[PDB]
Amino acid sequence: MSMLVVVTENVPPRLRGRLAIWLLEVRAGVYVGDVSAKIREMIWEQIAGLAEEGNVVMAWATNTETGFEFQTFGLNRRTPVDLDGLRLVSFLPV
Amino acid sequence: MSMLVVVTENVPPRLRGRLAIWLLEVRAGVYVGDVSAKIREMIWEQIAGLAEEGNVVMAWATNTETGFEFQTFGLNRRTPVDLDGLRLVSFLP
Amino acid sequence: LPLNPIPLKDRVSMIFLQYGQIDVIDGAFVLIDKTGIRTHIPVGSVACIMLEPGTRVSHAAVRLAAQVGTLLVWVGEAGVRVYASGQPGARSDKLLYQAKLALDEDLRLKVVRKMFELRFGEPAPARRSVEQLRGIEGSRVRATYALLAKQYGVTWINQCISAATSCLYGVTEAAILAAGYAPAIGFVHTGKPLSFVYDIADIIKFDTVVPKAFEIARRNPGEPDREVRLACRDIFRSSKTLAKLIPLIEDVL
Amino acid sequence: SMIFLQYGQIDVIDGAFVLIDKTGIRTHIPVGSVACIMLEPGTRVSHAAVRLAAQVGTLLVWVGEAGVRVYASGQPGGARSDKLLYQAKLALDEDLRLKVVRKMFELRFGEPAPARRSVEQLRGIEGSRVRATYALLAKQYGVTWNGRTINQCISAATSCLYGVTEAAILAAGYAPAIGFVHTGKPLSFVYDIADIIKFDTVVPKAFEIARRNPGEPDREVRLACRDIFRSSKTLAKLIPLIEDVLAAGEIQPP
Amino acid sequence: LPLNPIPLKDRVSMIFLQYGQIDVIDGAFVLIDKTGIRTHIPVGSVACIMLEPGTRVSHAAVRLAAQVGTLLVWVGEAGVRVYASGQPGGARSDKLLYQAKLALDEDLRLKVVRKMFELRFGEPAPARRSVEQLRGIEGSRVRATYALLAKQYGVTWNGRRYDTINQCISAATSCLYGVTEAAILAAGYAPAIGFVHTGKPLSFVYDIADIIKFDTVVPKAFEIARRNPGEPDREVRLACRDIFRSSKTLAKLIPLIEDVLAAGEIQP
Amino acid sequence: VSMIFLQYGQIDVIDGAFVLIDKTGIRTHIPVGSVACIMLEPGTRVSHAAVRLAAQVGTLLVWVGEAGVRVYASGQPGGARSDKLLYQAKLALDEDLRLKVVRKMFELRFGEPAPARRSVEQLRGIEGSRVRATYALLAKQYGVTWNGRTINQCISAATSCLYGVTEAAILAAGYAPAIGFVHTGKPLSFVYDIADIIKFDTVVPKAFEIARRNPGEPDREVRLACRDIFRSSKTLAKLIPLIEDVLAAGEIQPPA
DNA sequence: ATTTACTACTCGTTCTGGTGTTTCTCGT
DNA sequence: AAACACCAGAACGAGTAGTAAATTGGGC
């Protein structure tokens, strides 16, 4: 069981509700909670399914070099980038 | 060493840059990283210092029942509420 | 997409809702109050939700809470349990297992003696019937209540004890249901709708829950209800109660 | 004794159950008057309502339209120890279970079950005729029948029946998981009782709707069954049936 | 508000920058490329940042990296270190003089080398052996260990040469030399004042790093070279990250340096 | 052998030689060999090939503020030459040699040799007395209100600026700023030693001159003043031989 | 040649208040 | 009566481009 963070943008109210069933919406589209690996991989199924043409990123705590991992869904100006195993995010200009 | 999350709104570019020195800005005003207790407490000084008329919330992983704690700075529609030791956030109209 | 309940141990223990109307906005639990402020409650994150007077639940609210596997408890004065709602039942084999044990006095005695053995650590005297054991049980409980009065210095408070135990009864019933057993079919306690709840809870009741009630009761603090709840909350967290409940029921049987 | 309250708030005025419908009052319920309250969508229960119901021993069940689907019920797990153990003993004993299954068969078709046939044998006979019964109804309504659109309708229909059937089992005070013909499933007992009256009205309506081939047959069947359960008073006749079925064990009930 | 460096152990190991211009926007490190895409790099999270050819750092960039305590390394072919920049002051006056006195004294210098030898292997060094003799023995063992690793992983070995396997070994060690130099600076010592290695601008870096290089870093390079991946640079770098993570290298470097110097039996 | 200050341009290598590309795209060819150290003022952007070339020829890169007023980062940190570091070290590790170095500093600071048989503690007392008097005199010479170390704000700004070129000089020489003789324990101990020698020459009196007037922004004014002095009076260029002269007083042979 | 403070202006999302429509993810 | 899909709006903050100002948070 490790910390979980979900940030959603331009997502239908359907998913925005679903995430509020397990996680805590501290800010607009920002959900924070502490779940397990099995539950986390279930939260992603909810995101991949209920989110249409909207961008969502989910970051969870691990024992990696960064101390955490993150995966994205949909397109956005801020896309993740691989730097020799290290994942960062880049800002795309138009 | 535990996970850290900082969400900023109406914050001057000074702090938005400063946070990107240690943390990873995954979304607009959303910073994620893994720091220690001592480092977490210095980032809050940066937030409390460089943010003057902006609202910021910081959530970090702990060994509480929720698994995490969160602290706020400034005013926002979503303010935290205490429910018998357990803290949640309410939506003010 | 379908929504299923997460394991009980991987959840918070209890939350207390006291005023406002409980509706379902965009598919999520919310608490709207008199002044119109809304509050979302992570229901699939909570093992059990206590509903105090002044709350008005909607139809969708009860429906949502059942699917996510959260027990709803309508609570009275000083946190006493009034009513409860949960999924319309749960697993047959686990239920028949419990049943057969209770239908046979020989097997029932085995279960009761184990409860005794777990509650006090020492085996019960041999050739002692269930009726006889309950008499002994009362004596030990009566004495334990008296001791706590001397250890913490109290005058033999009831509001604190009831409130604390009520919290334990909440998660205990939530555990029995999530496990798939029936809270009505007990072994030591019988005839009551929460017989099995009282059986399991009484075993670990005096470990930390009841003496803590005396600790809070030792002083004379404002709003004893809050003082007890956050205390019980820490117990369930520190002593990892929720994780220990499911194996305990199975261990007893 | 059971009532269906819909589209309103359940409060307690003058020491009695009430349903506020914007127009005020509209329904007064004495306390000994209702054994159990079914709550359809559109209802908002109050704390005082639930508090009163607990003091007096009233079962609260949240149902869909006309009991078509059950979502949550008060006093979960069970409410009476004796009613559960009664059902339990009946299913745990090879002698008692066979008696009950035979009664189910007899009630389902109207004719007594063969004496020299075991439950496994009974299940086989039951299976043979129902497949044929499905074929008959298909020819009667003139549809294209294969092995079990039509299947979608039947499925929707049975789901509706399982709602009121489970709603009856709960109101009766028994456990839906402890079955006799069906076992191992969490809703085994629901399937047993429902199969008895399944071909009475539920299944034939499914064939009727499938013949007309509606754009959204799922909804049409549910609302149809909804209407059936109300007019044909399905739920009201189910509870005595459940008690009658279990009574075949010749053991005294609570 | 003031900006200070966080402890080394609490950081990521290394990042590799390849093209684009490195400037400072709103007080933070960014990597803008030819196509205008920007990438923010947390500096006070990385022990050292490696700069490959095609990179163009700004003045504020070098300034910022120094303030946060992050080492900048301009690297060559297969990541070999070329140049490096860091806080001009830095270090501890006593810690520097401590290291100095140890290297200025022929008796103490030998003592320190013996500790390095003892730490390098499992056995203490033979007595009455001069620094010249010990280095000769060490070289023999290092050369022999390379041959052994060649047999264990099954590669075609001729000689350790610095100009596939040699590319991997150099790349792996380059990563280790990076964080090692980053550790020595943050600890407060001088990377130029060595004991086994002398005369080199990174003598002490080679001393400390050589001790634990054959532990997991160098043999890992042989594992990668056998497999012959399309991008051996990436394969080796990503490998080293895991090594530094699992073996808590950054956390282990600072005590190692202190332990080695302590063999002089002088209180720091 | 020499030293260069490059500002407001990009440091690259296009024809196999150092060039300084300007905003309008003017380049300026700089022979990398022949120059001992390159100072980079704000506004500069070094390229990778540039640094690599500078590394091959053995030229030190130091990131400085305007005219070396402030040091921010320097290439080959920790040190670059072992011998120059050990040279400085031995001087500070030997109490007898340390005294020799301090005496040289004293003689250079004032002009007259220090009294014989005086320890560092004894010498610092003399030094302090002279400094307070020099502060008082400057107060009389420029006519300001002095209460002992606005005026203090100017002096502090000035000395900070002086520490810049002084530290930058120590780096270019190849020595460590942490190993001092008069000052000890501080990470910039050696910086304070050399700077104190020439501080009252032009740096401090200029601070009084600005303090004599009353500008709205004394912080910038003093810094910009010191900047102009370091450029015009070529201070940093005069500093490097001085450091070598000071250390030579130990009567120990200096590194090649 | 950098970098930041400052300033409209563009653009994007969240949120709200208005109807129209449903009582609803099955098959044991 | 309760709840969602839907639509059109206001309201807010993030982001971009252009202009003007510095080359800077100090004291041994």
Side-chain angles (χ1 to χ4, degrees), chain D:
Chain D
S1 296
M2 56 192 322
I3 194 180
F4 279 77
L5 303 184
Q6 83 171 314
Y7 294 177
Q9 179 174 358
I10 308 309
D11 208 4
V12 173
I13 301 302
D14 287 339
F17 279 97
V18 75
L19 174 137
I20 316 284
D21 195 68
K22 293 174 180 177
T23 60
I25 309 192
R26 92 135 56 262
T27 307
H28 203 263
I29 301 170
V31 206
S33 167
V34 60
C36 168
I37 301 193
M38 323 290 275
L39 299 161
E40 310 190 278
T43 53
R44 169 168 300 276
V45 200
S46 172
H47 184 273
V50 191
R51 177 183 24 203
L52 175 62
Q55 156 193 17
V56 309
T58 296
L59 180 74
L60 272 172
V61 180
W62 287 260
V63 296
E65 271 181 341
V68 62
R69 291 201 174 76
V70 181
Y71 302 142
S73 80
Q75 309 176 312
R80 295 181 58 181
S81 187
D82 49 23
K83 293 281 191 175
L84 266 57
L85 299 159
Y86 180 65
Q87 194 190 348
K89 187 176 182 190
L90 292 193
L92 288 175
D93 185 15
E94 294 288 275
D95 286 336
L96 296 169
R97 178 171 84 181
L98 182 130
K99 294 199 184 203
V100 181
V101 172
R102 176 182 306 276
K103 185 58 180 294
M104 286 176 185
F105 191 98
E106 174 186 322
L107 279 166
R108 182 155 187 183
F109 312 107
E111 58 192 4
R116 287 186 333 259
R117 286 183 173 270
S118 161
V119 182
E120 291 274 9
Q121 294 207 308
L122 291 171
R123 182 59 181 277
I125 302 178
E126 187 180 10
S128 64
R129 52 174 65 195
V130 293
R131 292 184 180 179
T133 312
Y134 274 119
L136 175 61
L137 286 176
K139 196 176 169 170
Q140 287 199 309
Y141 286 83
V143 299
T144 316
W145 179 258
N146 294 338
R148 175 71 177 96
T149 310
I150 173 58
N151 282 269
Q152 186 190 28
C153 288
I154 301 189
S155 298
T158 56
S159 295
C160 297
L161 183 52
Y162 292 164
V164 286
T165 305
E166 172 176 22
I169 300 183
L170 292 174
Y174 301 106
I178 307 183
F180 297 86
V181 176
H182 301 73
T183 323
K185 298 300 180 183
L187 288 191
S188 308
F189 198 47
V190 176
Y191 305 143
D192 289 15
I193 284 66
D195 282 24
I196 302 186
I197 67 172
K198 197 206 273 187
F199 287 101
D200 286 8
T201 314
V202 181
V203 174
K205 185 73 66 267
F207 279 95
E208 170 181 343
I209 308 193
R211 181 55 180 104
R212 302 188 265 94
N213 209 288
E216 41 177 13
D218 297 276
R219 192 173 97 95
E220 279 257 352
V221 168
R222 184 205 316 117
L223 282 300
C225 292
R226 183 270 302 246
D227 287 351
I228 302 187
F229 300 149
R230 294 186 171 160
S231 180
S232 57
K233 64 186 173 303
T234 302
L235 195 44
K237 68 181 57 182
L238 278 172
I239 308 191
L241 179 55
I242 293 175
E243 306 273 18
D244 184 25
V245 169
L246 301 183
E250 303 182 39
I251 269 53
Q252 291 289 341

Side-chain angles (χ1 to χ4, degrees), chain F:
Chain F
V1 191
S2 296
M3 172 203 55
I4 315 289
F5 280 77
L6 304 183
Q7 83 171 314
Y8 293 178
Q10 308 191 30
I11 312 309
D12 207 4
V13 173
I14 182 60
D15 202 28
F18 270 182
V19 300
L20 173 75
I21 314 284
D22 198 344
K23 173 76 175 187
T24 57
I26 299 192
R27 86 180 53 105
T28 307
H29 295 239
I30 303 166
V32 204
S34 169
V35 286
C37 172
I38 301 193
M39 323 290 275
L40 300 161
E41 311 191 327
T44 53
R45 166 166 297 132
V46 200
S47 71
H48 183 273
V51 190
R52 180 183 196 163
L53 175 61
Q56 291 180 332
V57 305
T59 296
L60 180 73
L61 272 172
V62 180
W63 287 260
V64 296
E66 270 180 341
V69 63
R70 295 202 177 280
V71 183
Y72 302 142
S74 80
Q76 307 294 127
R81 294 181 58 181
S82 56
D83 49 24
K84 295 204 110 65
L85 266 57
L86 299 159
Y87 179 64
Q88 194 189 348
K90 187 176 182 190
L91 292 193
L93 287 175
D94 184 273
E95 295 290 329
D96 285 336
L97 296 170
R98 176 172 175 254
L99 182 77
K100 294 200 183 203
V101 181
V102 172
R103 290 192 84 86
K104 184 58 180 186
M105 287 176 186
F106 191 99
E107 175 186 322
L108 280 167
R109 182 154 188 183
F110 309 107
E112 59 193 25
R117 285 188 63 261
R118 276 69 166 171
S119 61
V120 182
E121 190 274 337
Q122 294 207 308
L123 291 171
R124 75 178 62 176
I126 303 178
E127 187 180 10
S129 168
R130 301 278 283 275
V131 171
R132 292 186 295 101
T134 312
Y135 275 146
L137 176 61
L138 286 177
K140 193 41 193 167
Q141 288 201 230
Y142 286 83
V144 297
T145 316
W146 181 258
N147 294 339
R149 175 127 205 93
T150 61
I151 172 58
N152 280 359
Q153 186 191 28
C154 289
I155 302 189
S156 298
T159 56
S160 61
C161 296
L162 183 52
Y163 292 164
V165 286
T166 304
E167 172 176 22
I170 301 183
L171 292 174
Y175 299 105
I179 306 183
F181 298 94
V182 176
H183 301 73
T184 46
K186 299 301 179 304
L188 288 191
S189 308
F190 198 47
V191 176
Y192 303 144
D193 289 15
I194 284 66
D196 282 24
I197 302 185
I198 66 172
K199 84 155 67 193
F200 287 103
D201 285 9
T202 314
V203 181
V204 175
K206 187 74 182 178
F208 278 86
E209 170 181 343
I210 309 193
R212 177 52 177 103
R213 303 189 266 279
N214 210 24
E217 319 178 290
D219 297 89
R220 191 173 97 252
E221 221 68 64
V222 168
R223 184 206 317 117
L224 285 186
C226 292
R227 181 193 61 172
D228 288 351
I229 303 187
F230 300 150
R231 294 186 171 160
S232 180
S233 173
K234 63 187 173 183
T235 56
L236 198 164
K238 290 178 180 179
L239 279 172
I240 308 191
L242 180 138
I243 290 116
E244 306 273 18
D245 184 25
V246 170
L247 301 183
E251 303 284 63
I252 269 53
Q253 186 73 7

Side-chain angles (χ1 to χ4, degrees), chain C residues 21-23 51-60 62-63 66-67 71 74-76 81-93 95-96 98-100 102-103 173 177 181-186 191-193 195, chain D residues 9 39-48 50-51 53-55 58-60 62-64 70-81 84-86 88-89 91-92 166 170 175-178 183-188:
Chain C
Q21 67 175 17
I22 303 141
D23 321 329
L51 301 161
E52 310 192 326
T55 54
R56 297 163 300 114
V57 305
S58 71
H59 183 273
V62 190
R63 178 186 195 278
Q67 290 181 332
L71 180 73
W74 287 261
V75 148
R81 170 173 175 295
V82 181
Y83 207 75
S85 80
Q87 308 177 311
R91 196 186 273 257
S92 56
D93 49 24
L95 180 53
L96 298 159
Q98 193 190 348
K100 188 175 183 86
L103 288 175
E173 172 176 21
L177 292 174
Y181 300 106
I185 307 183
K192 298 175 161 58
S195 308
Chain D
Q9 179 174 358
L39 299 161
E40 310 190 278
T43 53
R44 169 168 300 276
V45 200
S46 172
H47 184 273
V50 191
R51 177 183 24 203
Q55 156 193 17
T58 296
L59 180 74
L60 272 172
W62 287 260
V63 296
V70 181
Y71 302 142
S73 80
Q75 309 176 312
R80 295 181 58 181
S81 187
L84 266 57
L85 299 159
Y86 180 65
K89 187 176 182 190
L92 288 175
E166 172 176 22
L170 292 174
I178 307 183
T183 323
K185 298 300 180 183
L187 288 191
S188 308

Side-chain angles (χ1 to χ4, degrees), chain E residues 38-108:
Chain E
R38 301 158 269 169
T39 306
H40 292 239
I41 304 165
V43 211
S45 294
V46 193
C48 58
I49 299 193
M50 325 289 275
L51 300 161
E52 310 191 10
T55 53
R56 296 160 52 244
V57 305
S58 71
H59 183 76
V62 190
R63 176 187 193 165
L64 175 62
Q67 291 179 332
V68 306
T70 297
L71 180 73
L72 268 40
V73 179
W74 288 261
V75 296
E77 185 96 8
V80 61
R81 171 172 175 295
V82 181
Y83 207 75
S85 80
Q87 311 175 311
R92 297 260 298 106
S93 55
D94 49 23
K95 295 203 111 66
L96 180 53
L97 298 159
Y98 179 64
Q99 193 190 348
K101 188 175 182 86
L102 291 192
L104 287 175
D105 184 273
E106 294 177 301
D107 286 336
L108 295 169

Side-chain angles (χ1 to χ4, degrees), chain E residues 159-175:
Chain E
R160 175 72 177 97
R161 302 165 187 182
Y162 347 88
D163 200 33
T164 310
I165 173 58
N166 282 0
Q167 185 191 28
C168 289
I169 300 189
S170 64
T173 55
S174 295
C175 296

Side-chain angles (χ1 to χ4, degrees), chain C residues 223-238:
Chain C
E223 42 176 13
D225 294 345
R226 281 193 60 257
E227 280 256 352
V228 167
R229 293 178 186 149
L230 62 90
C232 292
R233 182 190 298 282
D234 286 351
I235 303 300
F236 301 147
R237 167 187 73 81
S238 62

